[PDB]
Symmetry: D2
């Protein structure tokens, strides 16, 4: 552990890992501190949908940022594999957003004018996916709302960062950021470090740092429970999505299934009632899943903010300190654009003012 | 591996392990052959209830054998620990057989005249176990229908048998039993061995040997799926039982919960619909289970016979061959009595004639 | 389960799975029977090297068959993914066969005349792989001796076969093949089935079937123990190979490490002494591995034959019966060529006579 | 969660769980806060030896406290089971401290004058334990240095505390302790709570709180790596111990084997070189272990202090604050005595002054 770094990142989920990579790529001398292991919390619980078209209700700067991040994934697998040897496991089948009523149909068809979406009738859906529930009314097909394996996107980013000279410290929680002197310094149980810039990317745990730095921004966990099964018997290429729940086919032959929403629960392991509810929902979407062998079950904590949008930007009173936290159901999707925007700010490059405004820290 | 043994046991579940122990205690030179690892199939799936009082319909020979076997468990843990160093994990809390209707109350109170049983009102049940469902009408308390951990009963028996001289061959499937000569022989992939007596204790897989030896006795698997949770928050001492389903409190703090009944299914891991149904049923018996963290899921194959009773006895044309298989939901309970009976028969000792008839091979 | 099939395959490792696929692709009505789960035995233990240049000592028909099978892998990932949705996880880094003495150098340089191999000096090796042991003398670089994840090659083959109409029966061991009538029929615990052709692909367990069919061909297990670690800190692209031991970098960031050779041991789980020896060897090849976190440990049984070559062909007295078993350290490599050769025979196509001879059943 | 508690415990390992129990038994309104799950860190890594006689150098106050704590285990299993339903799994076989040189024999025989100990010759050791290494010179037999399973001691204490009224908050890290007011308060991400007394029992992570409260007491992790195997073949009743390494027979049939010593390492999973060294050492103590099937690998962080002794006592400037942390290799042994001492201090009862001095916070 060196005494001085140009940039220090606090937290090693997908968000901090991406930021470290983009900083290292700009030749900033960078360190990352993670309390546990890289990718070991909410990042490991995520399905991995690049779900930009759960964001086009409202068609605003948040949708625009989401589509930009989706485009950034285009060459990303190759770029990171060349440096890390780690495959992000991209699956380009796309998504059927299912309807189970005429009310569902009217809501989904509001997206018809987007070039990125096409409406499929009940019969057109079943020709492509014969095992989708016969109670559907049709589905919006979203070709580019693909998926990746999030733990491996995170490991790819961090290994690439390391090969570009970033210094990674697992099992090293950050206790304090100060703030006082002409440089920031951070305190850890194994010594102290100075930095020209500090980035807080500690997910749902980020509130301690806002408060330490004179800011009241808070986070509420919304727990989500999931399971996986082996699909050894039927074809399924597209992701199936309904009412924030999903069945995602991975290239291992597993299906990933979720999820509950349990506000205010900080526990990271699933309950019996939660898993029961996940099973019940999945069966309404793909009836044949009742016969599939169960693999695993898990949970994670979504980092909920007051208004439901992330904080991505500078401390309003100190440009040396930055935050990137509060990606509720979209942190995998938004990892590259988040990483790029934070790196650009630290480098004093011009950035998109609509995104700078939308994600700013002081939203009064 | 020797050329000849006085007795050979085929199968290393709880039934075969018990038989080898009783035989070695009689100073029979004994070997046991098991296809995989000891206790690795149906024995590992069982809850471990000593459920004699799910067996008192017609209060007959089968009920008498069950009560005898239950009594044989009295000093067993201490006996086997002295030779093996393995604890069978006996829990003497007893069982509440619950009622959820006036029909249930009638059926259950027919046991009131037995010394083994006492009726509890709704209010008396909730005094002892406040978290039992408030929809009950009361319960029968059976003090002696206690529980053990069946994998460790199996390991205790086999290690005890080893210390007394038995030779145990894991990863050694038996392919054939030959009758034609003065003594028997068996064939394995590691070589062929002679034996004075052979005992078939291969569970639901026993059909192959019956057929090989001129008998049409057949087995149907009835698969059962179970789950466990951690009970970190409430007191629960007694087992809860209703309509062949159960919640069994272990001394680790886990609850064992089951079970489905799927006839004709030879698969040994649980599917999604089965686990969903187990969770649904458990919640009606103990509502607070909804909030408990899930630990593990599993399944096993009950060995079903034409009339639901096991075959424990000699081949009717050859007293050198014996069978001990088809213990449907009662093989943990019946392991000691089954072992003692087969060993007594090999020794040509007098045995109970009602039991010998009830479990005979030739039932037409 | 139907009464009649055109072709029946006994065993569901990678070999039987491939054969079922090629038969289904020829529109033969096919069934496969597997005792347990698909790919669940020796196939799951394998590293997955396509190791043809461990076969060019002797430069004979076996080397030629191995190179042919390696070429068959070229478009295989894509062909199977299109039908199954399962990714075989191919890694095209290639292999350094290391030397640690001048005697090693002379032996490896015997391959220099092959276009598929280039000799690298000590310094040339370390420029590509700086963490390979500094005690090496150089290495042969074998560009096309790449690797795949064998469990997933097997799952891809079987899911593709199913989509082409093959019928797959897990948890259905075959008890007997007969032989007697104008058609073969096979016996299982859940009923009997007739077939115009039967293929034995039961790996190290295949001996029972040879013997049932009047043939004395035998198999000896050679157990191999392995482990995996997480490589989160150093670059490693090429497989490292020395004296039948190896370090294989997977695209998850894990390294796969092996292996012991324990003749006559049928146990399928690793010993303490075996794993210790694997650790010791790995450290001599890649010293930095001592600091890497351990992931998993496992074992499997290599199917050893008398002369060390597989049996791939017809029963000499009955062209309806075929065998494909005894691939010692090369069954992953040889899976496509094995599958193709068996399918071609069943279809009465002309085949390569050198390969037909080399792998024939009656090698006197 | 209430606004105020009479006592608050920070940390839910074995030390904190014990403290909460003794406090609730005194009818103190008590809460305990734990960052993750109860017993989930160093407590889960421990073998569970009650090793008082690895503590008799200078036969001093520390040895006396160890013997007192060992005596407190006498009725503990039964006491905690009555309230919790959780078995601590005590094994009363005792310990052989082995000698492999004349130097070892001299050191060990200095304990001969204690009532707790008896010397055994080589021949007398091998009579009792035939599989101990034949290279030994004899061993000291310590009957009372028995073992328990530490995770279940922890779970028993906490569940017992709950039944007596303690309120337990998992997934609730404490960020700060404030001294300035009439009562203390603590800050958590779920809100801030007042308390009359606060006890810091956060193991190797306790340094943060010392520093927060004006004290420079520091902690260094000494990581230890262990493994387990299945002992299915030999008798082993006594624990074997040599040079801080051990083989501990559990009543499940497992052996627990350890351990390395890696100062300065905060990582909590084992590396390859560490496990290799544990296997090598175990084979010198019990050669037959080479053939045993491996079960599990793990690691944990010993909380090392400047002089190797724990801090158990009051903050020297504020009697409302207490610490109980830095139990290096003896925290399972010392849990009962540590709990009773902290509880007695909170109650203002008279305590042993030698012990109060030996473990005081201000050692300069
Ligand atoms: C059920 C579920 C499914 C989801 N599915 C999707 C999906 O399909 N698509 C999508 O885009 N999003 C999805 N999400 C959302 C996504 O998981 C999150 O937005 C994302 O993982 C947040 O990333 P992060 O790096 O901020 O947080 P985390 O992964 O939680 O990482 C934060 C890290 O900070 C560390 N930390 C905390 N405190 C400190 C400290 N003091 N010092 C050092 N380190 C510290 C932690 O140990 C942790 O590793 C899903 C979420 C859930 C729970
Ligand atoms: C969900 C579930 C819950 C249950 N709960 C209870 C309960 O609470 N109480 C109770 O009393 N009972 C219970 N049972 C029933 C109990 O599990 C069985 O009756 C009992 O395990 C049967 O033991 P076994 O030794 O006959 O069979 P198994 O344990 O299946 O052993 C047979 C052995 O034979 C071996 N074998 C097969 N073929 C060969 C061969 N060719 N050569 C060598 N070896 C071979 C197998 O590998 C296997 O290990 C339960 C069952 C299920 C499924
Ligand atoms: C440590 C290790 C590493 C290896 N690494 C490599 C490598 O890198 N490259 C390579 O090419 N090879 C490697 N091998 C060799 C390779 O694993 C084998 O050659 C290959 O898996 C054999 O395939 P199989 O289908 O014949 O056997 P298996 O995978 O063992 O399949 C046979 C199947 O038959 C079933 N069966 C048995 N009896 C019956 C019955 N009565 N009825 C129905 N089914 C039955 C079994 O359940 C089993 O699933 C390695 C082997 C080991 C052990
Ligand atoms: C390999 C190994 C073998 C050992 N074998 C033995 C043995 O045989 N016998 C013996 O007596 N001892 C043994 N020990 C030592 C023993 O494990 C320890 O002395 C003991 O576990 C310490 O318990 P603890 O409660 O202090 O620490 P821990 O169990 O580490 O508990 C501390 C708790 O504090 C929590 N925490 C930290 N920060 C906060 C916060 N801010 N807010 C809330 N909670 C927080 C943590 O999450 C943790 O659960 C062994 C140790 C090792 C590593």
């Amino acid at each position: 552990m060196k005494r001085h770094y140009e940039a220090v990142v606090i937290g090693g989920g997908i968000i901090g890992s991406a930021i470290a990579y983009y900083l290292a790529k700009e030749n900033k001398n960078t360190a990352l501190f993670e309390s546990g292991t890289m990718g070991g919390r909410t990042t490991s619980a995520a399905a991995g949908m690049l779900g930009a078209h759960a964001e086009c209700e409202e068609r605003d700067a948040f949708f625009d940022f989401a589509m930009h991040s989706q485009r950034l994934y285009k060459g990303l697998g190759e770029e990171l594999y060349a440096l890390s040897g780690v495959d992000i496991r991209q699956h380009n089948g796309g998504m059927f957003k299912l309807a189970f009523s005429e009310e569902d149909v009217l809501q989904l068809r509001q997206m018809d004018d987007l070039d990125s979406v096409s409406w499929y009738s009940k019969e057109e859906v079943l020709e492509k996916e014969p095992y989708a529930s016969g109670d559907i009314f049709g589905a919006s097909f979203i070709q580019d709302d693909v998926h990746v394996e999030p733990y491996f996107v995170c490991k790819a980013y961090v290994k690439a960062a390391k090969m570009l000279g970033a210094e990674i410290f697992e099992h090293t929680p950050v206790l304090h950021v100060e703030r006082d002197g002409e440089a920031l310094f951070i305190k850890t149980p194994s010594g102290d470090v100075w930095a020209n810039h500090v980035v807080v990317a500690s997910g749902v745990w980020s509130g301690m740092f806002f408060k330490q730095l004179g800011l009241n921004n808070a986070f509420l966990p919304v727990k989500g429970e999931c399971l996986s099964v082996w699909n050894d018997d039927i074809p399924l290429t597209k992701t199936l999505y309904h009412d924030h729940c999903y069945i995602v086919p991975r290239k291992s032959g597993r299906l990933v299934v979720g999820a509950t929403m349990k506000p205010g629960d900080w526990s990271e392991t699933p309950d019996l009632g939660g898993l029961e509810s996940v099973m019940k929902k999945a069966k309404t979407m793909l009836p044949a899943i009742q016969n599939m062998k169960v693999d695993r079950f898990w949970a994670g904590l979504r980092p909920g903010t007051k208004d439901g949008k992330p904080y991505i930007g500078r401390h309003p009173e100190d440009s040396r300190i930055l935050f990137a936290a509060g990606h509720f159901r979209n942190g995998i999707l938004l990892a590259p654009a988040t990483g790029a925007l934070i790196s650009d700010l630290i480098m004093n490059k011009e950035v998109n003012q609509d995104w700078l405004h939308a994600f700013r820290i002081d939203r009064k």
